[PDB]
Structures are given as structure tokens and as C-alpha cells.
Design a protein around this ligand. Sequence first.
Ligand SMILES: [Zn+2]
Ligand SMILES: [Zn+2]
Length: 1263
Amino acid sequence: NFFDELRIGLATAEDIRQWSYGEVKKPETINYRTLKPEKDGLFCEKIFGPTRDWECYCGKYKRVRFKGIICERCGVEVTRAKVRRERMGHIELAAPVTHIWYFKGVPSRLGYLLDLAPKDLEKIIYFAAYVITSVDEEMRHNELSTLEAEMAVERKAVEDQRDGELEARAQKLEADLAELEAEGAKADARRKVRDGGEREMRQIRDRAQRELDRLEDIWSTFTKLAPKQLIVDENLYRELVDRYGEYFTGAMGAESIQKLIENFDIDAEAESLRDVIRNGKGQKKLRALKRLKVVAAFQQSGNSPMGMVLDAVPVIPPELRPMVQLDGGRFATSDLNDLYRRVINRNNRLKRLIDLGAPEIIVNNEKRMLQESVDALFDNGRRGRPVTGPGNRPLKSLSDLLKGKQGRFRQNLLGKRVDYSGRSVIVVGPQLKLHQCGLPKLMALELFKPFVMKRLVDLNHAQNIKSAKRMVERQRPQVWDVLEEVIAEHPVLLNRAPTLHRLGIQAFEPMLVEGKAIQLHPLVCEAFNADFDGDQMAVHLPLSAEAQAEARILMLSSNNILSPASGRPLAMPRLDMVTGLYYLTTEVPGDTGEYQPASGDHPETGVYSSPAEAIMAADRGVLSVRAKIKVRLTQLRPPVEIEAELFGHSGWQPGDAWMAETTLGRVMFNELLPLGYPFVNKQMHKKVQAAIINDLAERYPMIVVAQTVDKLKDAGFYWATRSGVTVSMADVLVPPRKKEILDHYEERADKVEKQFQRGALNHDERNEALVEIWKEATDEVGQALREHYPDDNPIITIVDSGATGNFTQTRTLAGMKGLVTNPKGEFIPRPVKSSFREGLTVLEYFINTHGARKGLADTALRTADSGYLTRRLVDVSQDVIVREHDCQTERGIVVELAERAPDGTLIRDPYIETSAYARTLGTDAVDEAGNVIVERGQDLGDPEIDALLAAGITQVKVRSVLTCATSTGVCATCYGRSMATGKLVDIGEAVGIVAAQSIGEPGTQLTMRDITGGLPRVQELFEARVPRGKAPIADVTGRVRLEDGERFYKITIVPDDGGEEVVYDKISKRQRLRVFKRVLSDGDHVEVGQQLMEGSADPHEVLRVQGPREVQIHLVREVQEVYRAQGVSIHDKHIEVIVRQMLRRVTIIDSGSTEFLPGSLIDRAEFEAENRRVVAEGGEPAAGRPVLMGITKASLATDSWLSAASFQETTRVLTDAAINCRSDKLNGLKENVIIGKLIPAGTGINRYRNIAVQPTEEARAAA
DNA sequence: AAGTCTAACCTATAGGATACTTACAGGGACACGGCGAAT
RNA sequence: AGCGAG
DNA sequence: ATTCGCCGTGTCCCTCTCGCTGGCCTATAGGTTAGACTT
Ligand SMILES: [Zn+2]
Ligand SMILES: [Zn+2]
């Protein structure tokens, strides 16, 4: 494999016949009976190749020795049967045809190149109007006079005819008058002939005038006749040609367009376009820019446009165009055969017709047929009507195999079915270890079949590979002995679709299990989002030693305890385990065997010599595992204070002793944590366990953390059972004051309803009043309920301990359901007053159904919206790979980090764990000329945050991805800590995909609540769409004058400088202005960019008026606000990576002198390089401006056409790449994935991919 | 058993003469085109 | 065309 | 009436993944091809 470039471009007919191994003539596929491809047919062996390996049509050649020889009678080259898959055919068109893509795709590249228009082009090519290929006008000055004489002569003849007609009409009128006056009749009767003669002469002179005007019109057109015009009125074309056919050439159809392109200079058109843009303006300027792009695509490159009009069409080989019998031997081909056959039929008929010689009408018709058929072949449905086979189904065309999901790109390149794989339903495997997963032997046998045969053949269980195959297929007993051996230390990847985030795929060590279900360690469930209710999961087998190393090291379950999103652990006790630990470690005052300071009657009688004595006592009904006792701990480090006081500085604690007023349950728990962890002595509410595991991961090695979570799972499962947390109707206690307060609130509801009946307020007013009153009612009922429940209740125990569920669910269970959403989104003002325990009545259930159904449908659609957003984010930010240890730059954003309180205090800012942690300092922290507290270029973790807060400093400068000064991808330090590892990132981590996936996975959790505020808001922000309500923002400092205009608000910002008074008047009075320390108090000195009105701010205007730093900060701020409304913790640095990928192009206004379009987007790096280059050898430095692109446009406007082709708009991307003759460099993750070579991320980078290993000198010595 | 030697079969071409004349979502975005002031 | 998991 | 600047309307590519089940009529010359004897 030696790949470097895919330089797609226009394929001229010469190349088409160059590829072709032959030329299919007739539309004959397969013989009726012998089932053999015909000669010169669409499958002919001589053209494509032999359908059977080592054979030929007549069959006189069958041996392999004379390979590569073509027979005599039938002329079939003796090669492999598979060579048909590659050799390609072609067909010669009698008349040229136009490629559908360039002609019809909007904007019409053909029209832009030839200055013509879409409907006009449709008319000329499809034989509806004529076009002039060229005309030579230079020798027309004398010809002007000569033809003037000729036309004067014919006009004299026309006048002769006209006066003859007039004289004849006059004679007829005289005769009619003589005949009428010769007989007596009505006066009107005898003057009717006079009227008729008058009308007849009138219409005669009218016709003469009209034809004279037509002659004069065609004369004027001839005076100013030029090429590139549509001659509608075929009769006029016939007149023009049969009178002056010579010296000017006209044509119709694709041949006419080809002639027009031939007699045309690209350089002249390019120079004209340059001149117009040099002196143009307005929409004329924009059209000039677009057409200049189209033409300069050809001009700058060596690809001429003559390849757009096709003389020969290629034929995809046969095996990509199957023809196979099936079912009852019924042949079942594909649709391309019909399209190709139609093209062939049209072509043969056209050839014959031209040969025989037919009137231009029929040949034009046949050419039109061939044109529309080639269009359907290349792209069905793009023009005319979708050619529909039987059943009115649009036949698949060659283009269709690209677009959409079913196309090649998204279906068989970016994801493929794989061998050595399987799937099954999953079940909880609590006896498993974290790094283990079960495997039903009926599946492991089939997966490892390749291996078991080897290990048994070499064990002589069989005597050859085939015999071993028999043993496996027979499932003979010995296999289960060898299988159990060939499976050990052989990881397998467990996957669960959808693979929302990076943790979806995890490598486990498999162990044999009986049954039919993949046993899954429960801890990893949260990583997979799996719940054992019928979930199916897939097992994949990594074969190669490199792959097995990747499975063991990179992807093993125990090596991945922290979510890449924000570092929150995922393999931590959850749900059942949380309840078990909460029961184990809580402290109930009054349980059996308390520690009492008794005197006189007896000593304390609460102390215990060792936890051994404690467990022995607790085995009998003497002590409870949640009672306060004074134990003598001798194997656990005490808390910080006890150790620091008793032992002073360095008191080791594997063999010492100390008193602890704890609960035996807590001692049991703390024995689970490592030997070094200080005794915690608390109640393990879920947040506490999260903190414990996070501390362990940050400080302790990974193996210790994995073992600790394993033991925590064990203890939690063991103790949740004895916790007796069960649900029963006696354990769901209704509040006692329900009826009275409900009656009082209903009385208030009746009062407001009476007010409505008197017209005191409108129906919306009373609806709002009822909704608000009943919301107060729900608040009161919930408060009373939470008051009533004692902590020992199973439901409140489950909820309070953080095992699962929110409290509002318990309010519904025993309380009232509250308001119920009307399907539009409003609130049904009844509202439900019956608790699910008490049993809803019929109408209340029917009302609740609205909310349930709308929730389900919203989830169904939002899942797809989230998936699409994830795909777009992944495509924008795939190239962002950490590929340098250090920028060594000096820039970097700042962080608020606990700003001072108004009274004076370092109240911690709410957002630190998602915007301050895991960064590298761009500066050194000094307080009031104090000592340097923390040094530059060091990882910033929680101890440094506590140090900073203690110091008295809040503003901090931190290195960030936004200010990364690297060329290709971000550098390590500018990125900072990696969440999953907890250390500084490697120099191969594909952090872009991590950012995209961690930003996308929270999706399907943000419910929409006019300016959007849910997932669609995040979509708008990333896509950079203009917001709905454009709240105007200030442009300059100074006091502001505000007036409540007629249905709007007028605002004038006094510019501090001599700026123009920015005045805004067209604002809906409904929207309220921004509020601040006042609702834009008249005269406020809002800054040059403060949002004046309260609403949404366009990122484009913010960038324009404040700069890239501010727009980056604003985008990250808004996206974080949207994600945090639902309490999701995601570090910005992912969002900053996305924003960085959005802001990497600059729009230019000065052409410089190096092939730059004013207003074309170009990446910053090449922009600066071009500016530096052009500064040398004639200084015209192009001055550009930053632009904020949308994610989709950023994905499309890339340097590689493969990624853009596979992303979306495949036809447009391919046409553009063909015209520009672009060349992919195969330097992207997605690309190398398609062509199946190592991705330049992780282990595929040159540094790690080229490691060389040989044993050390001492190792060679030991041999 | 291919190499003749014998005897069919099958199919692209062609040919026959009343009369008959017009089938049968939605959203965003951009590009192709209405309405108005200026020269 | 129907269905399971999210 | 053309220029330039606005609006206005029409036509088109995109919105998650992974499983499973079933359901006319000849006439003729030339190409082509069946079977059989053999040394
Ligand atoms: Zn042959
Ligand atoms: Zn950097």
C-alpha cells in the first residue's frame, strides 16, 4: 500500500476510452437458455473478463499454465474470475451529451462558466432553442451597405405586393358598391359591404405593417447580432439561416454547447472578470465573484472544461452491476442494467437514424431522449422525471450510490460488519471482577473457533485441521478443556449501541459462563448506560498482537474509571450499592449497644478492644452495625487532625493504635479503602462516595482504585439486602393535613373563578391565576409530605441517600400530581389532586396521558437531533490532535475564579470544576507584590485552587486551547490535564473527537422549555445561526437616551467620541430591556458592546464589535449556561476546542497580488504565510478580518475533499472537487479510516508507530 | 477421443395492403426575480 | 409491515 | 430606460445507532448446433 493523493478531476472522453478494456455495443446481457453473456453485450467476457476462472467463451483453454493469453475464436483473455470486478467498459455516443451534475446542480457551473442562465441552458441543451457557436463580423462594413441594398429591393417588392393588394381591394369595393346600389334594400345592408371592404383593407395594411416591422426588427438584431443567444421562434431561425446561413454558425443541444466551449478563451473571460471586480460594485460584484471562482477553477489549474461535455460514457464493471439467479433460478439484476440498456437503446437507434438520414425533428427527438437517459443514468430524479421501473419505484442511478445513508460512504466505508464477532442479551455478574466479563461457551466456542483448532491439533486431540473442525462442530467434550485454556488473557471488546461516548466500547477479559447471556460487571453499567431489561451487547475479538495490546492497555475496563467528559467517576457505587453503603455507614442514635458514659452502675461499656471484638459482638444481638461505639482502631490511618495531634508529624498507621468514636459499620467500610486513606467517619451519601473515589483516582494508582471499587461493590451488594429497604403500601404514608389545605386552595380557586364569572379578568388571566394558586398548593403539599416522613421510610431512604429518583416522584406517589401539561405546552388548570397511591380518577388519568405521550415523542425526536449534532461536532473537530508538547506561547484566557464579594470575601464562583481545574498556567501568581504562589507551566489541581483562595487572588491567567499557537493541532500543555488519565495528555490523543463526543453525549437530556433555550439553542450557537430576537447591543460608550415609542422603543446611544449617534427604533415593545445593577436606566454608560435589549446576541456582531477573544468567551459562556441548566458537568476545554475549530478562517477584503478573492474565507495560517510572501517581492499586504463560521460550513470548507464528500452534500462536494481538481493528502483521521491505513492519532502517530525494541545488553548476556 | 463426418434447428432479416391523425413535512439557504429612488 | 434496547 | 438598492418567492439537501421476525403470422439465407464413426 503506497497512497498519497486522490486528485479527482474532470474526465475527458479520451480518458474514458483509455480506461475501457473494450466497448459494449448491444444491450444484450445473458443468453436465454445457456445462461452465458453475449458477445459485445453489457457483460461480454472479452470486454470485462471471464466469468469463470481459467476458462474462455469457447472453452478450449482451461489450464493455468497458459495464463494471460486471449483465445482466438472468442477472444477472451484467460485471467482470474475476479478481474471482472475491476476492468471497466465504455460506450460511444453518436451525439455528445452533457454531464447532468455540472449542468443542473445549483449554481449551474456550466452556465456560470459560459455566462448563460439555468432555464436558458435547459432550453438549449434539451433541444428547445438554438445557440450561435460563433460569427465573424469583421468584414461587415461593406456587407452592411450591400445587404441594405438587398433589403431595399425586397422591401420594394413587398410594397409592390401591398399596393397590388390595395388596388384589388379597391376594385372589389367598387364592384360591391355597384352591385349593392343596383338593387333596392336597407341602407345598412348596402353599406355592410363598404364596412367589410374597409375592414379588409385595414387588416391587409395591418399585416403588411406587421411583416415590415418584423423585417426591420430582424435587421436591427443583425446589426447588433452576437453569439451566446437563444433563438426562440424556430421560424425566425429558419428565416435567418436560409437567408444568411453563411458566415454565422448555429447549433442545438450538447454539441452546440461543446462547440461554444471550444471557440472560447478562458484567459479572456478571466481577465474580463478581474476587470469587472476591479471596477464593479453591488450584486454585479457578487455575480462577478461567483463566476470568477467558477472560471478560475479551470484557469488556474491545467484541467480544461472540455471534459464537461461527454462523447463517451463509461460502464461500471459487471460485479458492481450484478446479474444473478435466485429463488427458483429467477435472475435478479440491479437497476443500473435498465438505465444502461436505455442509454444503449437510444444510442443504437440514434446511430441508425443518422445513417439512414431523417428530418431534423426526429434526430433532435432522439438526441433529447439520449440526453435525458444519460441524465437518469448518471443521476435519476435530478432532471425531468424519476425514471421509475415496475411498481413506480425510482430506479437507483450511479449517483444514488453516494448520497444519503444508503450510499457507499456512510454505509460501507465509515462502518462495516466484521467477522469474529457476536452479540447476546446481558445479565448482572456481581461475582465478577471489574476487569472481567462472562461469555457463554456456546458463543466463545464459535468466536475462538480459529484458535481452539490450533490448540487441540497441536495437543493431538485431532490429527489435522479438518479433523479439529469436526471436533468443534461436534462440540466434543475435550474442546471445553482446551477452550478454557486458549481464552485466558485474551481480551474482547464489549460494545453497546448506541456508542454515545468514548466509554461505550470497553475491553474485558472473558471468562467462560454457562447459560446464554453475557455476564456484565454491574459497576460498568453506568459507563454503557445499560440496564438489564433486555439490552443486547456485542462482543468483538481483537486478533493481531498490536490489537491485543491495545485491548489490554488502552481500553481495559479497570484502566477507565473516570468519564472523559468532566472527570466524574463512572465505575463507582451507584443505585443498589449506594443504598447498601448508606445503610452500612449511617448512624442511628438509640440502636442496640450504644456507647454511654455510665458511672457508678458500671463503666462506659461501649468500648471495644479491636474491630474483631466488634464483629464478634455484632454477630449476636448485642451490637448493631449503625451504633455509636468507641473502637480501638489499629489498621487505618486516623483523620488528619487525630493523626497530626496524637503522632505529631509522621505517625505511620499499619501497626499503631488510636481511639475512634465511630460506628462499627463505618469501620467495616473504611477497611475497604486502601491502607493509607485517612478514616472518613461520615455518612456515605452518594456525593461523598463520588468524592472518595475521585480522591483515590487522583492520588492512588489505577489498580488500587479498581480494586477499591470492586470491594465497595461487594460490600454494597452484601449490605443492601440486610438494609431491608422494601416498598409496601404501609410504607407510603399520605400526609395527614391533605384534605384541609386542598379544600382551602380549592376555595381560593372558586373565588378566582367567581371573579372570572363577573368579568373581573380575562380567561387567560384566570387560567394564570389558577395555575399560580395550584402551584402554591403543590409546594405546600410537598413541604408537608417531606415533613411527615421519618428518615427510616424506605422511599425517603432511597431518595435521600442518592441511590436514584428525585423527590418530586415521591411527591406524586403520595401527594398530588400537580399541574399537567396541555399538549400544546400550557398547563391544564384543573389540576390533578389525587395521588397515585390514592388512585387517580378517569379524567385525571386521561389528562396525565397528554404529558406522558408528549414526553415520549419528544424523547424519540430529540435522540435523533442529538445524534446529528454529535456527528457534526465530530466532523468539525476530528483534525484537532495533540501533536506537540509545548507551544511556549504567552497568551491565554483568564478565569474569574472566586471574585471578591461586595462586602469583601472570596466566595467561590459556582463554576470552577468546569472552567478552572485541569489547566496550565500562562503566568505566575503574585499577591500585592508577594511571593510567587504557583509557577507557570504547572498542572493546576485542587490544592492550587485552595492555595489561591487562601492567598487572596481571584483573577488568573491560564493557558487554553483557544490561544494554542500550534500549526496542525493543539499542543499538550495548552490543552492541559486529560480527565480519563488525570495526568497531562499524551502527544497522540485525538482530543477533538473526545470533545465532540463529550459535548454530544449529554444530549437527549436537555428538554426544550421566542428565543430557543434547549438543545436547538446549542445547535444554533454551534452552527452560528442568527438568533431569533436580535437584542441590539451597544456600539460605543456614553450615556443613553430611552423613549417608549409608538408600539416600539427608541434608543439613542450618545457616542463618547464623535461617533454617529447609534439609534434603534424598530424593536418590539413586548421584549424587556437588559437589567443591571436597573433596566437600562436612561443615561447608562453601557460599554461599546453591552447588550442593550434583553434577548439573544448575534455572535457575528459580537465578533465584529469586540473581537475574537470576547466572542469566544461569549460562545463558551452561553453553551455552558445551556448545558448547566440541567446540571450537567462538562469542562469547557472541549467546548473551547470546538470554538477554536469554528474560528480558524479569515475573510479578506484586499486581493493582495496572489490569487485571492476579496471575501473568500481562508485559514489564518496560510493567510499569514501569503501575506509574508507577498510582502517580499512587491509589498501589497492583504488585510483580512476574522470571521465566525458555522460548524457545518467549517466541515465543508476543508482542505480534503474525502471528508467533505462523506459528511454531507456529496454531489456538491464531488462536483466542486472535480472542477477545482483538488487533491486530498490523506492526512486526516476519517480519510485514513476510509482507505484502511493507520489513523494519525494515538498509536498511529509516527513517534509511537516507529518504536524499535531489542533486548538490553544484559538480556543478550543472560541468553 | 478430438477429429472429422453427418445431419439437422434456429434465428436475424424480411414481407403482407378497407379504415383509423394531439398521452396518462419543515427549515435553512440561495438564487432567480418584484417595487422604488437616482441619473 | 411489525417489534426490542436506549 | 439602465443602475443600484431594497424586498419577495421558488426550488432544493438535511434531522441517532444497533438488532430480530415475517412476507400478428409467415418466408428465407445464413449462422449455429444435435448426433455418429473412427484408428
Ligand atoms: Zn475460446
Ligand atoms: Zn499550545
